[PDB]
């Protein structure tokens, strides 16, 4: 689950670091009306793992 | 301001004449809080609009002025009379308001008379005390 501001940070992180701006913060939770649509709240810098 | 002019140009030809006559009386009365109101009519069965003017009810009263020790005839609307009573009377209304807000020759002349008289009496009283 990403918000409008969060999606920008995910896609173009350099657009914030080049201007020395902090990255957008992630959302706290989604509205209950969307239960069954999302599994986790996205983190603006994703945590990569091995596969 | 732009909207006000746009509305005025949509008035009926006879309502425009009445509007000009109302405005020409500004210098002869104590304008005070008098405002202009426009009547608009709409209908359910057609897309037609009629614009007309709402008249102002003028009242002739005699208010007491302690500085001048006189009952001054005045032409007022109800809203202006209510404001004057609330603020503390004619003397307080004229001494608590700048010349810019009066927007009337009759009001300005009356205010100037009161201000000059108040200073003369105050100066004499201050010297006495």
């Amino acid at each position: 689950y990403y918000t409008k501001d969060g999606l920008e940070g995910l896609l173009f992180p350099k657009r914030f670091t080049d201007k020395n701006l902090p990255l957008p913060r992630p959302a706290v939770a989604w509205h209950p009306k969307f239960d069954g649509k999302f599994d986790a709240v996205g983190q603006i810098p994703p945590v990569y793992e091995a596969v | 301001q732009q909207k006000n002019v746009e509305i005025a140009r949509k008035l009926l030809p006879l309502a425009k004449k009445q509007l000009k006559g109302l405005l020409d009386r500004q210098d002869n009365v104590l304008w005070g809080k008098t405002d202009i109101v426009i009547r608009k009519r709409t209908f359910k069965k057609n897309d037609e609009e009629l614009y007309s003017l709402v008249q102002v009810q003028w009242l002739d009263v005699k208010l007491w002025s302690n500085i001048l020790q006189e009952r001054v005839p005045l032409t007022l609307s109800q809203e202006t009379l209510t404001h004057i009573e609330s603020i503390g009377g004619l003397d307080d209304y004229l001494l608590k308001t700048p010349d810019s807000q009066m927007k009337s020759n009759f009001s300005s002349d009356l205010r100037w008379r009161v201000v000059c008289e108040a200073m003369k009496q105050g100066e004499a009283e201050s010297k006495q005390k």
Binding site: - | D35, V37, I38, R41, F43, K44, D99, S100, Q101
Partner: protein, 413 residues
């Protein structure tokens, strides 16, 4: 009633205060209001021609004090800020050096003022300290702009205040009066043509007596705020009143207390004023002013950048954070700086011994891009000094200096 009707009542809102734009005044108060709120010289000239005989002392004073505001500068000498609106001490534009008035407004202002000066003399003995201060301030503005060359009534205004050991001020003095008197006199002695020798002596003598007897001895500085105190400091600096430092310390204390209210255009003035007076022992005062540039970086103009750097070099006050702000701002405004102005700015950095990578890198790139460079002797040595003092090395500054030398040798007057 087959066709149902709905009725709406619309009220036409109007401004609370009347602008005396079209109606003719018919009273003592109305005439004063129309003159004060006049928008154009044609309106003021019309009022004087029609209601000439219905004038009093107050009416003449008001007309003179408002005339400077009706004279507008050329649009080519003004640069508009992005989104800035009129406010307390902030304008939507900044002025280029030595701005000129509009071509078609000078003859109107000169003609109108001549008529006013003719009828004023009879009213000279009915003026108050407030009225005298405003007249002095107005004339100083009218001299900075190319309207007048001297104040005919300067001798009378100064005498009126000086009489009876400043008795008039002792009862009717406020913070504004001192700010306007000193600021007005400074602009009457430096702006435009330099001065007359007798005029300079009288003005400087009066200012020294006024400052010591009123502001210092009687403690009237308690009536001054940060802005008024800053204005006095600027006036003293232009008059080179370096002998008395007691008042300077008092004024600096007032500025320190109300530092938050000053804008970047006011902080730069304080730096320059202190630099001209040579007062460099107030390090604490300098530190407080430097802290005011952190948040108001959007209200800085090339004039503020140039004044701040030059003042710091003269004062010897080196703040890394403040210098960093000036360098970064200047790097983007290189197109606004003149060739002479940009040479002084570079020299200022060299004297301080600060090497700003972005600032010098931008300058070198611009110079190299220029195919034909023509550097004048007046500032050729300044740019060379800045590179040498700033420690710029063979990377690309030797090429820039090489072109500088070649251009200078190309003329060798």
């Amino acid at each position: 009633y087959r066709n149902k009707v709905t009725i709406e009542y619309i009220k036409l809102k109007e401004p609370e205060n009347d602008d005396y734009a079209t109606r003719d005044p018919t009273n003592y108060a109305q005439l004063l209001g129309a003159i004060s709120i006049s928008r154009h010289l044609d309106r003021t000239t019309y009022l004087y021609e029609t209601f000439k005989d219905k004038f009093d002392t107050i009416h003449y004073v008001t007309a003179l004090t408002k005339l400077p505001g009706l004279v507008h500068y050329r649009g080519a000498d003004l640069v508009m800020r992005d989104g800035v609106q009129w406010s307390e001490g902030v304008k939507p534009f900044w002025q280029k050096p030595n701005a000129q008035p509009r071509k078609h407004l000078l003859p109107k202002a000169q003609g109108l003022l001549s008529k006013l000066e003719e009828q004023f003399p009879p009213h000279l003995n009915n003026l108050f300290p407030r009225q005298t201060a405003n007249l002095i301030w107005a004339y100083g503005q009218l001299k900075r702009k190319q309207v007048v060359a001297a104040c005919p009534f300067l001798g009378d205004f100064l005498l009126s205040l000086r009489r009876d050991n400043f008795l008039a001020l002792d009862k009717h003095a406020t913070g504004a009066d001192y700010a306007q008197i000193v600021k007005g006199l400074a602009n009457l002695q430096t702006a435009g043509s330099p001065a007359d020798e007798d005029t300079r002596a009288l003005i400087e003598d009066f200012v020294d007596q006024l400052t010591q007897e009123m502001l210092l001895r009687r403690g009237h500085a308690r009536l001054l705020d940060a802005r008024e105190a800053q204005s006095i400091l600027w006036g003293l600096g232009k008059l080179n009143r370096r002998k008395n430092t007691a008042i300077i310390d008092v004024l600096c204390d007032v500025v320190l207390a109300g530092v938050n209210s000053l804008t970047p255009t006011a902080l730069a003035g304080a730096f320059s004023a202190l630099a001209k007076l040579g007062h460099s022992s107030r390090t604490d005062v300098f530190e407080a002013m430097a802290k005011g540039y952190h948040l108001q970086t959007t209200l800085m103009s090339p004039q503020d950048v140039s004044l701040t750097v030059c003042a710091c070099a003269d004062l010897g006050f080196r703040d890394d954070n403040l210098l960093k702000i000036c360098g970064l701002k200047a790097a983007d405004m290189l197109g606004e700086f003149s060739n002479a102005s940009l040479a002084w700015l570079m020299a200022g950095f060299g004297r301080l011994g600060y090497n700003h990578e972005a600032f010098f890198s931008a300058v070198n790139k611009s110079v190299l891009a220029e195919p034909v460079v023509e550097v004048e002797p007046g500032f050729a040595w300044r740019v060379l000094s800045a590179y040498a003092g700033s420690g710029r090395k063979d990377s690309e500054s030797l090429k820039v200096c090489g072109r500088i030398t070649e251009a200078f040798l190309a003329k060798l007057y």
